[PDB]
Design a protein around this ligand. Sequence first.
Ligand SMILES: Cc1nn(C)c(C)c1CC(=O)Nc1ccccn1
Ligand SMILES: [Cl-]
Length: 154
Amino acid sequence: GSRIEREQHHLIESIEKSTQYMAKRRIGALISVARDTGMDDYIETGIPLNAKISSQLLINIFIPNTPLHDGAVIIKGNEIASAASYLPLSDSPFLSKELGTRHRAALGISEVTDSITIVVSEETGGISLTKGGELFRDVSEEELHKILLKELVT
Ligand SMILES: Cc1nn(C)c(C)c1CC(=O)Nc1ccccn1
Ligand SMILES: [Cl-]
């Protein structure tokens, strides 16, 4: 009851710290947090980790030209379920064309699941979020904290 609430805030803090580190260095990232709708089919596409959640591990996963970086990290429950997992690309023509594959993958998974997905752009270092087919582009740290707090702490 209260143990899961402490885990969710640790999940939020882990996302904030890792995205800040990667944004400063323009390291692309794609982190999808599953919810009610299971993402088990997409977890199976990646390399399984089943690891404890930490900002340190999230950073090490997305280091460029490493075995674990090319794809999405999926967080299920209180674990980093998989890395290098593949997410469906959205077919939306409304998505801006200056955004890349990570943004299109984050939008695609938000259209068929209720998951919260976070993106770090390797071109601009901007942090974006997707939920329910919508895109919050280049959010600030306050905006990111408010969205994650509302959507991840039940
Ligand atoms: C869904 C899918 N299956 N397969 C074989 C491909 C190539 C895709 C789409 C895709 O490129 N998704 C992606 C790209 C970057 C990060 C995360 N997902
Ligand atoms: Cl990108």
